[PDB]
Amino acid sequence: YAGLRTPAESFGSGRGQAHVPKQDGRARRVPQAVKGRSAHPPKTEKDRS
Amino acid sequence: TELQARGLTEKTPDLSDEDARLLTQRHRVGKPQFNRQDHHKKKRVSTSWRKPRGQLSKQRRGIKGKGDTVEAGFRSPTAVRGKHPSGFEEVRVHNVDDLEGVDGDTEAVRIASKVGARKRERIEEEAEDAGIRVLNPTYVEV
Amino acid sequence: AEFDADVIVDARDCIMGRVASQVAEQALDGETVAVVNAERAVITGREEQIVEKYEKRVDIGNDNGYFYPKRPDGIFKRTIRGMLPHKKQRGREAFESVRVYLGNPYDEDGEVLDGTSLDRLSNIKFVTLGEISETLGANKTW
Amino acid sequence: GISYSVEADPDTTAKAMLRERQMSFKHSKAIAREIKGKTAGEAVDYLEAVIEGDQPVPFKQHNSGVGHKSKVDGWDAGRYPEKASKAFLDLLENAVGNADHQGFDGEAMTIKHVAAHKVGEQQGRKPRAMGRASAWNSPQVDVELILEEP
RNA sequence: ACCCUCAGAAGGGAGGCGAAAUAGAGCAUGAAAUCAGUUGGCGAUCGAGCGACAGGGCAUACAAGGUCCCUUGACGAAUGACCGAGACGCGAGUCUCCAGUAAGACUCACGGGAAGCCGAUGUUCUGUCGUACGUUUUGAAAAACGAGCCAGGGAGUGUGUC
RNA sequence: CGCUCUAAUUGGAUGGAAGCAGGGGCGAGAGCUCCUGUGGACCGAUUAGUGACGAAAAUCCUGGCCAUAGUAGCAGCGAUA
Ligand SMILES: [Cl-]
Ligand SMILES: [Cl-]
Ligand SMILES: [Cl-]
Ligand SMILES: [Cl-]
Ligand SMILES: [Cl-]
Ligand SMILES: [Cl-]
Ligand SMILES: [Cl-]
Ligand SMILES: [Mg+2]
Ligand SMILES: [Mg+2]
Ligand SMILES: [Mg+2]
Ligand SMILES: [Mg+2]
Ligand SMILES: [Mg+2]
Ligand SMILES: [Mg+2]
Ligand SMILES: [Mg+2]
Ligand SMILES: [Mg+2]
Ligand SMILES: [Mg+2]
Ligand SMILES: [Mg+2]
Ligand SMILES: [Mg+2]
Ligand code: NA
Ligand code: NA
Ligand code: NA
Ligand code: NA
Ligand code: NA
Ligand code: NA
Ligand code: NA
Ligand code: NA
Ligand code: NA
Ligand code: NA
Ligand code: NA
Numbered sequence: 001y002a003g004l005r006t007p008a009e010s011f012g013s014g015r016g017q018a019h020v021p022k023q024d025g026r027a028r029r030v031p032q033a034v035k036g037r038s039a040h041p042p043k044t045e046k047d048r049s
Numbered sequence: 050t051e052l053q054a055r056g057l058t059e060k061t062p063d064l065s066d067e068d069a070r071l072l073t074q075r076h077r078v079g080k081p082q083f084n085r086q087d088h089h090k091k092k093r094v095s096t097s098w099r100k101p102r103g104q105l106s107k108q109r110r111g112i113k114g115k116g117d118t119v120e121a122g123f124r125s126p127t128a129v130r131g132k133h134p135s136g137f138e139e140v141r142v143h144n145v146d147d148l149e150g151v152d153g154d155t156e157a158v159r160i161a162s163k164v165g166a167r168k169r170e171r172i173e174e175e176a177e178d179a180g181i182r183v184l185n186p187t188y189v190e191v
Numbered sequence: 192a193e194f195d196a197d198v199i200v201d202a203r204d205c206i207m208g209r210v211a212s213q214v215a216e217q218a219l220d221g222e223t224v225a226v227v228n229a230e231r232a233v234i235t236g237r238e239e240q241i242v243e244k245y246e247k248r249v250d251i252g253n254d255n256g257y258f259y260p261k262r263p264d265g266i267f268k269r270t271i272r273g274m275l276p277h278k279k280q281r282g283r284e285a286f287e288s289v290r291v292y293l294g295n296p297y298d299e300d301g302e303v304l305d306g307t308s309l310d311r312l313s314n315i316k317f318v319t320l321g322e323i324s325e326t327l328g329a330n331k332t333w
Numbered sequence: 334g335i336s337y338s339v340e341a342d343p344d345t346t347a348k349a350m351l352r353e354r355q356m357s358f359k360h361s362k363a364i365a366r367e368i369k370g371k372t373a374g375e376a377v378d379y380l381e382a383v384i385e386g387d388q389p390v391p392f393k394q395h396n397s398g399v400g401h402k403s404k405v406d407g408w409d410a411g412r413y414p415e416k417a418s419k420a421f422l423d424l425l426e427n428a429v430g431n432a433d434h435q436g437f438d439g440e441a442m443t444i445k446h447v448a449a450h451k452v453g454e455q456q457g458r459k460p461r462a463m464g465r466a467s468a469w470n471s472p473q474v475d476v477e478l479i480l481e482e483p
Numbered sequence: 484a485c486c487c488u489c490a491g492a493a494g495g496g497a498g499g500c501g502a503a504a505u506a507g508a509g510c511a512u513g514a515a516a517u518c519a520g521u522u523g524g525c526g527a528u529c530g531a532g533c534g535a536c537a538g539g540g541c542a543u544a545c546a547a548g549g550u551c552c553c554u555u556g557a558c559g560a561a562u563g564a565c566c567g568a569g570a571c572g573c574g575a576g577u578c579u580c581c582a583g584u585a586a587g588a589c590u591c592a593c594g595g596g597a598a599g600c601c602g603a604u605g606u607u608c609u610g611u612c613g614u615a616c617g618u619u620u621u622g623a624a625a626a627a628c629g630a631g632c633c634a635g636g637g638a639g640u641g642u643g644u645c
Numbered sequence: 646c647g648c649u650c651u652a653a654u655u656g657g658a659u660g661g662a663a664g665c666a667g668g669g670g671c672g673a674g675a676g677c678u679c680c681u682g683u684g685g686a687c688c689g690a691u692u693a694g695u696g697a698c699g700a701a702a703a704u705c706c707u708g709g710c711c712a713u714a715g716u717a718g719c720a721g722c723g724a725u726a
């Protein structure tokens with residue numbers, strides 16, 4: 001759940017902003033955002049044997 | 050009262066006429082810069098070469114003036130490809146056990162940069178006596 | 192105020208464009224030229240029509256302006272300019288090393304470049320730049 | 334802060350510096366630029382004239398809308414920035430002092446080197462309409478000075 | 484520390500400590516964007532995808548590249564003469580012979596030279612070509628879409644099964 | 646070709662590692678290498694592996710920054726001081 005712990009939502013079109021989920025102005029969750037989630041991170045459920 | 054480089058600095062390798070021609074050819078035909086398209090219009094774009102991938106790229110489409118595109122045709126001659134401009138064949142050296150097996154008539158040696166002053170000294174003095182020229186010599190005062 | 196012309200041409204009774212063309216080519220050969228008797232130069236065709244074309248050139252313009260000559264003086268000089276890349280270093284140079292004069296301010300007599308002469312006995316539809324300049328409203332300073 | 338960007342033989346030169354001064358960096362470039370080369374004293378006399386409004390300081394770089402001053406020579410714009418001019422005096426004060434505490438003839442000395450540097454901004458905020466506030470900052474300026482025996 | 488300066492526990496100067504103060508307080512290193520000062524090239528009569536490839540000017544401490552120029556000669560691919568002689572054509576000009584000769588790019592040798600001199604680097608001038616990039620699109624320089632700049636961040640991943 | 650960390654084999658560093666700055670050499674190229682200065686403690690090669698592995702772009706994300714500009718505002722309200 002890293003980076004998924006937020007109710008960040010995107011403002012949509014309207015304020016000359018790119019539709020990126022923001023919370024308190026901070027941009028997030030989304031991978032391309034600092035403090036965002038990891039897109040394809042290492043996974044425990046992986047059989048490394 | 051002056052600086053002088055250690056080792057055989059003037060030593061020239063001996064090449065077959067052919068290699069000497071091919072070498073000469075290389076140095077005469079040279080090649081294009083091969084810098085990434087428009088690396089010069091944006092500071093965030095670097096000189097390092099990248100394939101123009103743009104569907105409309107002027108360079109990719111091969112428009113004269115937009116620079117050359119990396120192709121095999123530009124390869125240097127097999128026979129001299131990779132030689133120091135002196136003619137020699139460079140040899141990467143990190144210590145003395147590295148000088149063992151080198152032929153000063155064909156190859157010149159290049160002491161790695163990490164190698165310290167103390168070890169360079171041995172390598173420089175040794176390599177000299179084996180007839181091997183060192184490309185990055187130490188300039189002492191005599 | 193003195194012009195060391197390596198060549199002095201006599202326009203008098205000579206097809207303007209044709210003189211222009213040669214004087215142009217020559218100045219591009221480093222030659223310094225001086226066209227003399229500009230006002231007595233000739234151009235073929237139907238006066239009414241000709242004069243109509245130059246009148247239009249006088250009327251054309253806007254705030255950026257299209258300054259167009261009326262004196263036979265220079266344009267003749269303009270005609271020459273139009274055969275010279277006057278906006279390139281070289282070009283401007285050549286052009287600037289050429290001058291057109293009314294009558295002849297020199298002691299020598301300009302020569303008559305080949306092919307440029309118009310024989311008045313076999314032609315009747317031609318005009319004098321002076322005739323043109325007069326119509327254009329220019330003051331007959333010559 | 335800054336360090337002297339220029340060499341100085343201690344035997345024929347005196348130094349001085351202003352630090353994080355809150356004054357126009359733009360006015361500083363101008364004043365500096367304008368007094369470089371003058372004699373420490375001439376410099377003072379000069380700034381005094383500026384602070385007093387009898388000698389304008391040419392604004393060649395930062396001059397949008399600046400009105401032409403007839404006393405400016407070889408140029409049109411600029412103004413008489415007292416504040417920054419004054420700060421420079423405190424500098425020449427310091428400079429000439431050291432200069433003398435060393436045996437030199439401070440005033441008689443030449444302004445070999447003198448340049449202003451934006452050392453940073455003291456940040457501030459100013460409320461605007463629509464529930465939005467924007468920047469409102471003070472420039473923080475450093476300026477080095479070097480005096481050399483003529 | 485002390486001393487000087489200053490309205491001054493500020494700041495500045497000098498000075499002391501340490502291998503290092505360009506380790507003096509968000510105090511290891513210290514890029515880019517970018518700012519000040521300054522150096523080189525350009526510059527107040529001249530034209531705009533900013534360049535590529537050529538070739539000139541000016542500029543260059545060492546090191547890590549050492550070549551480059553002119554006489555002559557040798558070799559000499561494709562190509563390929565002048566002149567002279569003879570002969571055709573109204574003519575512009577052509578044919579035959581001299582002759583596949585002289586010439587001919589690269590390279591090498593002799594002799595002479597160059598050290599800002601050759602490479603190279605910065606910049607500027609000339610020649611040729613040249614209306615970014617990525618996307619959308621039959622068709623983009625586009626009066627279609629995206630970005631002010633730079634740095635760092637940013638997209639084929641796991642399990643099961645076939 | 647380049648990046649991480651693991652392993653085997655094998656190297657370099659206080660007689661100065663990585664990093665960074667400017668510069669020289671090699672490779673068609675990804676990129677490799679050296680010199681000088683800075684830096685002051687780490688760094689490789691090969692081989693087999695391991696990927697949270699390569700950006701110019703997304704009105705992309707965060708941070709810093711320039712022009713805008715010494716510009717607009719610091720006047721307007723029946724309370725002109
Ligand atoms: Cl290959
Ligand atoms: Cl007009
Ligand atoms: Cl032109
Ligand atoms: Cl007729
Ligand atoms: Cl500012
Ligand atoms: Cl050859
Ligand atoms: Cl894929
Ligand atoms: Mg996170
Ligand atoms: Mg760039
Ligand atoms: Mg104004
Ligand atoms: Mg409100
Ligand atoms: Mg620091
Ligand atoms: Mg359409
Ligand atoms: Mg091994
Ligand atoms: Mg990255
Ligand atoms: Mg991309
Ligand atoms: Mg304005
Ligand atoms: Mg009142
Ligand atoms: Na939370
Ligand atoms: Na598992
Ligand atoms: Na005509
Ligand atoms: Na007109
Ligand atoms: Na201006
Ligand atoms: Na004046
Ligand atoms: Na004036
Ligand atoms: Na050049
Ligand atoms: Na698009
Ligand atoms: Na496009
Ligand atoms: Na269009």
Ligand code: NA
Nearest residue numbers: 016017018704
């Ligand atoms: Na934006």
Ligand SMILES: [Sr+2]
Nearest residue numbers: 161162163164
């Ligand atoms: Sr080193």
Ligand SMILES: [Sr+2]
Nearest residue numbers: 212213216217
């Ligand atoms: Sr001709």
Ligand SMILES: [Sr+2]
Nearest residue numbers: 394395396397
């Ligand atoms: Sr300005």
Ligand SMILES: [Sr+2]
Nearest residue numbers: 496497498504
């Ligand atoms: Sr000190």
Ligand SMILES: [Sr+2]
Nearest residue numbers: 559583584587
């Ligand atoms: Sr032959």
Ligand SMILES: [Sr+2]
Nearest residue numbers: 039637697698
């Ligand atoms: Sr990634």
Ligand SMILES: [Sr+2]
Nearest residue numbers: 468711712713
């Ligand atoms: Sr600003």
Ligand SMILES: [Sr+2]
Nearest residue numbers: 719720725726
């Ligand atoms: Sr008021």
Ligand SMILES: [Sr+2]
Nearest residue numbers: 462720721722
């Ligand atoms: Sr109002």
